[PDB]
Amino acid sequence: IEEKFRERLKELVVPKHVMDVVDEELSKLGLLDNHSSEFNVTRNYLDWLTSIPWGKYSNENLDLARAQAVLEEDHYGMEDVKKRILEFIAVSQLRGSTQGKILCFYGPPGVGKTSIARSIARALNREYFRFSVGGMTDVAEIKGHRRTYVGAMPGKIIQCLKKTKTENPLILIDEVD
Amino acid sequence: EKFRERLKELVVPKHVMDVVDEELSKLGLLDNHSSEFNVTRNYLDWLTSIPWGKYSNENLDLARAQAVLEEDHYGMEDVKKRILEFIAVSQLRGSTQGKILCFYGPPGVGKTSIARSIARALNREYFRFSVGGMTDVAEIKGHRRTYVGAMPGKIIQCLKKTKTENPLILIDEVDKIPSSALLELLDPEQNANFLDHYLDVPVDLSKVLFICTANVTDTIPEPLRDRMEMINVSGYVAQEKLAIAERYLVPQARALCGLDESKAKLSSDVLTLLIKQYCRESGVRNLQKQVEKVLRKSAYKIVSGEAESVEVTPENLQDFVGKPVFTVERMYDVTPPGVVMGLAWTAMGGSTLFVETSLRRPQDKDGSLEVTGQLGEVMKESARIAYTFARAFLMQHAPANDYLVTSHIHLHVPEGATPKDGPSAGCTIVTALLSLAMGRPVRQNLAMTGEVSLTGKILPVGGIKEKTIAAKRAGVTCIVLPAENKKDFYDLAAFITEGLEVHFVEHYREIFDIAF
Amino acid sequence: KIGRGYQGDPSSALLELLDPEQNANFLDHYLDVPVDLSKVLFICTANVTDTIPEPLRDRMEMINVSGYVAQEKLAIAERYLVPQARALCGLDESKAKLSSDVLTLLIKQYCRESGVRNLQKQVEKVLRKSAYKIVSGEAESVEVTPENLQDFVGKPVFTVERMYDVTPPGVVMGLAW
Ligand SMILES: Nc1ncnc2c1ncn2[C@@H]1O[C@H](COP(=O)(O)OP(=O)(O)O)[C@@H](O)[C@H]1O
Ligand SMILES: Nc1ncnc2c1ncn2[C@@H]1O[C@H](COP(=O)(O)OP(=O)(O)O)[C@@H](O)[C@H]1O
């Protein structure tokens, strides 16, 4: 029903283009015939559109002392990673807005890269999603399929957004090599 | 009403009760016997089917757990010990829901029956559903009520069948699997709140115990691997295959075929003939197939009028199973010069191989070695390294002996071993070349295995269990192993290594001394 | 039935028809009364072990039906194939006869596949080639000999093996399977 979709947006900050798309799809749903193929298509589409956290951010811990304690508590050593996270927090504190970076941890297996990533998420109070690019070989697993095709599921960043329900999710891409 | 007393007997949650009475009043606007009537009917039937508060009492008692585990299965002492450790840890922690157990090993070892045994031991309700390339979520979560194909799914069907909120769900063949659905099924953050598609109301899968089985772990996704505790289930030796067949396989199959003991029999001798001839695996799957074949043909016999009571002795066995396969045996009872008995760890299991060498041209210029056998790059490298070490060893030990460095040899290693541990025959190749160069045959009943480096260090190998099993089965009295496999050889059993003079070595020189 | 897409017919719709426990209440969309198919013997055929979805592949019991040896093929050709081909082409046994010798030769040099279809094709070809003569008036009767068989079935597809009444110093006889 259009009610659920209209309501799931009342707690978001939806951009104008997304709102245009949602409105035209809702009119299309109103005009379509129930439990038909096109209706299922438009329903799945509106579901995925209205289950994106459009203006929601989680509130981060910017206290250097507490973050440093949380880091020193879960892992020994790793001074490069810990200094990098502390500088990240200092720069995010010198501004008001939230910051976005792209880091790469490389090293032998079993040295705590994934675990320190989870600990960084805990210290920053962000969410935490991880997907593997370990051997994947189809670009659709990242970019998504059209709506025309039968399977038609959106990527994996869209799925991590829908899951974490926030826009500061600390994605972890394992095995990029 | 039927549905009313249904929900009255069991402890319903409030939101569920609200929704069910809502849909019941929605049917109250009667639309008798239509699509929108039977949809509501099936919805309410599934709802009053699902158990809501009722559960099964558990039993974390180690004594009864041990009794059940030893009764339901033979052997598997280490797997049983791991199960008891899990049970004790889960009694201490009290939750019994932390990490998922996953048994892996060769096919036919009965890692699917351990789940039933565990359900019996924990007094839970068992349920199994397999995941072989399902590629869909509709098996787990189901379909929507709008589709003409409207099914709740595997989980809700399990709940309706067990009538229990805390059953045991085995997941078969994970390594053959769609996976994100399993993640949402196993993660305790969302098991407590599980959403079926055919049932918009959620469900609580927090007290549910999940087990997994697989054939190999490498193909299981690393997300799941991070969430499973792997238990290794190994194959059975012939001595315990016999016990399994006598106590479980033959009674089960005789029940399957509608017979009983007074009409169809299978002696220990014919059973072990089956085990050693018509089956060369590490499980009991092919043995179970052969036993079912025997019993089906015996049933046909006793129906056709003849043979009111049939007996299968090792002489009339070809009437049932056919002609003996895997009959080929030791190729050399006294090996000539240039032939050595190595041990191989093949796919099916251990084997004994006869590495052979022969001069090929009549005897400046250097000699040459050509190698047959379907060898790969690594195995050709191993043959070259062994060749060079044997050359140098001879030119140091017998400096006047000119055989290796001038003659043209032909080496043949039989094609049994896996692509890995192919280099395990290095000491065998070196000894074959030395035995050919000198005029001496190798010690009489002597089998060997182990890797050799360019300077003669004896490097460790795998599959010591299979290799010593095949070595004993081939009638070998003296076995040679690398020195880093002392643990592997001594920690396997005592009824396998009794009359077996074993020699552990580190460099090749002492292999030479104990082989000549 | 390769793949299951929009309400896939291959497996989901058939497993509940081949599952021993499910079918006892078989729900058909029309005639919405779950019926029991308990006393029903299901025989499936295939020509590949794979390309059967595993949820069925484990429900059935694969029975292998391998090809035929030359003497099996000869017995089949004499019991069934030649009489049926005569009944179709309308030729009597006397107007054209196929000895066991010529049938053995045909099998040995023309039909070395696993089934009997190519053999039936060759027998039909011989019989219709002879029928043409009977009708065109020439050769009011026909006899097929291992010498003039090339006139009915063409030149052999396989190569003939040599034969040595006295073996030279180079050759040795051997038995093959
Ligand atoms: N410096 C460290 N301090 C504490 N634990 C560590 C450290 N390094 C590794 N570990 C432990 O090793 C385990 C496995 O590490 P993991 O994160 O799987 O390595 P990888 O980098 O391959 O993902 C983790 O559970 C973690 O607790
Ligand atoms: N140690 C054992 N004791 C009793 N039965 C066994 C044992 N090992 C295997 N089996 C038999 O093997 C069959 C199950 O094989 P299983 O190991 O489940 O194969 P898979 O692992 O491929 O599912 C069961 O019928 C079970 O009776």
Answer for the pair B213, B115: CB distance below 8 angstroms, yes or no. Answer: yes
Give residues with Cβ within 8 angstroms of A163, minimum separation 6: A129
- Cα–Cα distance measured from residue B314 to residue C36, given in angstroms and rounded to the nearest whole number: 44
Query: Mutating which of C54, C59, C62 best tests the B interface, going by the most B Cβ atoms within 10 A?
Result: C54
Distances (CA, A) of B322 to B274, B290, B297, C65: 11, 10, 12, 17
Give residues with Cβ within 8 angstroms of A173, minimum separation 6: A130, A131, A132, A133
Q: Closest Cα to residue B369, out of B348, B391, B344?
A: B391
Apex CA C91: angle with CA C128 and CA C126, to 5°?
Answer: 30
The residue to mutate among A79, A82, A111, A174, having the most atoms of ligand 1 within 8 angstroms of its beta carbon, is A111
What are the b/e assignments for B264-276, b being 16+ CB within 10 Å?
Answer: bbbeeebbbbbbb
- Cα–Cα distance measured from residue B158 to residue B51, given in angstroms and rounded to the nearest whole number: 11
Q: Closest Cα to residue B234, out of B500, B38, B488?
A: B488
Nearest-by-Cβ selection for B132 from C12, C29, C55: C55
- Cα–Cα distance measured from residue B195 to residue B190, given in angstroms and rounded to the nearest whole number: 9
* Distance (Å) from the alpha carbon of C51 to chain A's nearest alpha carbon: 21
Apex CA B40: angle with CA B35 and CA B43, to 5°?
Answer: 125
* Resolution (Å units): 3.2
Boundaries of domain holding C132:
70-151
Beta carbons within 10 angstroms of residue A131's beta carbon: 19
The ranges of chain B annotated as CATH 3.30.230.10 are: 339-515
Beta carbons within 10 angstroms of residue A45's beta carbon: 18
Angle between helices B35-49 and B2-9 (to 10 degrees): 20
Query: Mutating which of B41, B45, B127, B134 best tests the C interface, going by the most C Cβ atoms within 10 A?
Result: B134
Q: Which DSSP letter does residue A172 get? A: E
* Both structure tokens of B477: 């009295």
Answer for the pair B430, B452: CB distance below 8 angstroms, yes or no. Answer: yes
Nearest-by-Cβ selection for A35 from B146, B221, B222: B146
The ranges of chain B annotated as CATH 3.40.50.300 are: 62-232
| Nearest ligand (C-alpha, residue A118) | 1
* Distance (Å) from the alpha carbon of A147 to chain C's nearest alpha carbon: 14
Q: How far is CA C99 from the centre of its chain?
A: 21
Sheet holding B126-130, edge to edge: B126-130, B168-172, B209-214, B100-104, B228-232
Answer for the pair B229, B102: CB distance below 8 angstroms, yes or no. Answer: yes
- Cα–Cα distance measured from residue C99 to residue A174, given in angstroms and rounded to the nearest whole number: 74
The CATH number assigned to the domain holding C110 equals 1.10.8.60
- Cα–Cα distance measured from residue A164 to residue B241, given in angstroms and rounded to the nearest whole number: 51
Task: Kindly indicate whether the domain formed by B339-515 is annotated with CATH number 3.30.230.10.
Answer: yes
Using DSSP's 3-state secondary structure scheme, residue B311 falls into strand
Residues of chain A positioned with their CB less than 8 A from the CB of C5: 150
Give the dihedral sign, CA B358/B359/B364/B370: negative
B467 is catalytic: yes
3-state secondary structure A67-132: HHHHHHHHCCCCHHHHHHHHHHHHHHHHCCCCCCCCCCCCCCCCCCHHHHHHHHHHHHCCCCEEEE
- Cα–Cα distance measured from residue B32 to residue B27, given in angstroms and rounded to the nearest whole number: 9
Burial (0-12, 13-18, 19+ Cβ within 10 Å), B390: buried
Q: Which DSSP letter does residue B275 get? A: I
Q: List the residue whose alpha carbon is closest to atom 24 of ligand 2.
A: B110
Residues of chain C positioned with their CB less than 8 A from the CB of A37: 6
Q: What share of chain C is helix, strand, coil (3-state, %, to 5)?
A: 40, 5, 60
Query: Between chains, do B149 and C7 touch, taking CB under 8 Å as contact?
Result: yes
CA atoms within 13 A on the CB side of B471: 31
Selected from 3.30.2320.80, 2.40.160.20, 1.20.120.160, 1.10.8.60, the CATH number assigned to the domain covering B238-319 reads 1.10.8.60
Residues of B (369-428) whose Cβ lies below 8 Å from A: none
- Cα–Cα distance measured from residue B179 to residue B197, given in angstroms and rounded to the nearest whole number: 17
What is the tally of helices (H) and strands (E) in chain B? 20, 16
Apex CA A41: angle with CA A35 and CA A43, to 5°?
Answer: 70
What fold, for B62-232? Rossmann fold (3.40.50)
- Cα–Cα distance measured from residue C126 to residue C58, given in angstroms and rounded to the nearest whole number: 45
Q: List the residue whose alpha carbon is closest to atom 26 of ligand 2.
A: B110
Residue given tokens 């040795």 in the structure block: C172
The answer, yes or no, to whether any atom of ligand 2 lies below 6 A from the CB of B101, is no
The answer, yes or no, to whether any atom of ligand 2 lies below 6 A from the CB of B515, is no
Instruction: Say how many Å lie between the CA of residue B182 and the centre of ligand 1.
Output: 25
Distances (CA, A) of C71 to C74, C90, C107, C126: 5, 27, 9, 20
* Both structure tokens of B292: 């079912």
- Cα–Cα distance measured from residue A10 to residue B206, given in angstroms and rounded to the nearest whole number: 32
Residues of chain B positioned with their CB less than 8 A from the CB of C7: 147-149
Phi, psi of B61 (to 5 degrees): -75, 125
Q: Superfamily assignment of A64-177 in CATH?
A: P-loop containing nucleotide triphosphate hydrolases (3.40.50.300)
Sort strands B458-459 and B451-452 into parallel, antiparallel or unpaired: antiparallel
Answer for the pair A119, A168: CB distance below 8 angstroms, yes or no. Answer: no
Apex CA B244: angle with CA B241 and CA B247, to 5°?
Answer: 145
The answer, yes or no, to whether any atom of ligand 2 lies below 6 A from the CB of B170, is no
- Cα–Cα distance measured from residue B143 to residue B197, given in angstroms and rounded to the nearest whole number: 5
- Cα–Cα distance measured from residue B225 to residue B227, given in angstroms and rounded to the nearest whole number: 5
- Amino acid present at C116: V
Residue given tokens 């069925």 in the structure block: C56
Query: Between chains, do B149 and C58 touch, taking CB under 8 Å as contact?
Result: no
- Cα–Cα distance measured from residue A115 to residue A98, given in angstroms and rounded to the nearest whole number: 23
- Cα–Cα distance measured from residue B157 to residue A140, given in angstroms and rounded to the nearest whole number: 33
C6 touches chain A (CB under 8 A): yes
Apex CA A159: angle with CA A156 and CA A160, to 5°?
Answer: 90
Using DSSP's 3-state secondary structure scheme, residue B450 falls into coil
* B235 marked as part of a ligand binding site: no
The H-or-E segment that residue B101 falls in is strand B100-104
- Cα–Cα distance measured from residue B354 to residue B431, given in angstroms and rounded to the nearest whole number: 12
Instruction: Say how many Å lie between the CA of residue B76 and the centre of ligand 2.
Output: 11
State which approach was used to obtain the coordinates.
cryo-EM
- Cα–Cα distance measured from residue C13 to residue C31, given in angstroms and rounded to the nearest whole number: 16
* A113 marked as part of a ligand binding site: yes
B457 is catalytic: no
- Subunits touching C (CB < 8 Å, at least 3 pairs)? A, B
CA atoms within 13 A on the CB side of A34: 5
Angle between helices A64-74 and A113-124 (to 10 degrees): 150
Q: Closest Cα to residue B428, out of B438, B420, B418, B436?
A: B436
- Ranges of beta strands (E only) in A9-90 are none
Q: Closest Cα to residue A22, out of A34, A35, A12?
A: A12
Give residues with Cβ within 8 angstroms of B258, minimum separation 6: B299
Please, what is the end-to-end C-alpha distance for chain B in angstroms?
91
* A112 marked as part of a ligand binding site: yes
B146 touches chain A (CB under 8 A): yes
